């Protein structure tokens, strides 16, 4: 490894992943994420009952509740979202084993001008989404009371990540 790595220096496209976000922003980025955690399977069954009597009484309101604000995940799903430029925050796992899966994503998202960041460990992102593993997370819309601090961390990320890294 070490002699092979330094002999032919790590290309910046791959070198960008070994440098990541600081601990503090990671904590507050996570703090917002837990406020939008995807619904639990048990909760899914509960609302499936909720829609059961809803469709009995003419599907009631939009299902039973308002739009399900939560985080967006899945590499294919997020890539389709960022292409449509619907995404407002992008979070990339730092240690994905085949790096080719996200080796293009920072360059893609930079071309779209979207605030993004690299969050340590895939497992933590998976824990956000009740999964064993999440290679990438996306925030595309939140509630209005959450808009203020979401803009704050985006500015903070654009002050201690996105901006400082840029193209090096």
């Amino acid at each position: 490894r070490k002699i092979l790595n330094l002999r032919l220096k790590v290309p910046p496209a791959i070198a960008q992943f070994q440098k990541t976000l600081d601990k503090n922003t990671a904590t507050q980025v996570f703090k917002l994420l837990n406020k939008y955690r995807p619904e639990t399977a048990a909760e899914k069954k509960q609302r499936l009952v909720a829609e059961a009597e809803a469709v009995a009484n003419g599907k009631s309101a939009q299902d039973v509740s308002k739009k399900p604000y939560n985080v967006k995940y899945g590499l294919n799903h997020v890539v389709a979202l960022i292409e449509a430029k619907k995404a407002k925050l992008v979070l990339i796992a730092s240690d994905v084993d085949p790096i080719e899966l996200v080796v293009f994503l920072p360059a893609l998202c930079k071309k779209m001008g979207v605030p993004y960041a690299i969050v340590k460990n895939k497992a933590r992102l998976g824990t956000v989404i009740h999964q064993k593993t999440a290679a990438v997370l996306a925030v595309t819309e939140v509630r209005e009371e959450d808009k203020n601090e979401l803009a704050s961390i985006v500015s903070a990320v654009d002050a201690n990540f996105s901006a400082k890294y840029d193209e090096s």
Partner: protein, 94 residues
């Protein structure tokens, strides 16, 4: 078709009906999505050394040597001329 057998009009004289275009022939057409993807991968992946070498050959007006060297690398003239023209557009774009 002059109701005859020979000539650069030959054939049995009929009224040809304009056949539709079939989706197999669609191959080669550019999609804005894939054209965008190719732009992204070109910008992030970079270039192999041999096109690197030929492009300052274009930069210092060493066109003939670069064309010959590009032919040696790929194998056919059309691949070579297709290569150099797109690198030149890259050169003026830069």
């Amino acid at each position: 078709a002059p109701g005859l057998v020979v000539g650069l009009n030959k054939g049995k004289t009929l009224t040809k009906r304009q056949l539709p275009e079939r989706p197999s022939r669609r191959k080669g057409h550019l999609s804005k999505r894939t054209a965008f993807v190719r732009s992204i991968v070109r910008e992030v992946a970079g270039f192999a050394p041999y096109e690197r070498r030929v492009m300052e050959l274009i930069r210092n007006s060493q066109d003939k040597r670069a064309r010959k060297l590009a032919k040696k690398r790929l194998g056919t003239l059309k691949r070579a001329k297709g290569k150099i023209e797109e690198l030149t557009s890259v050169i003026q774009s830069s």
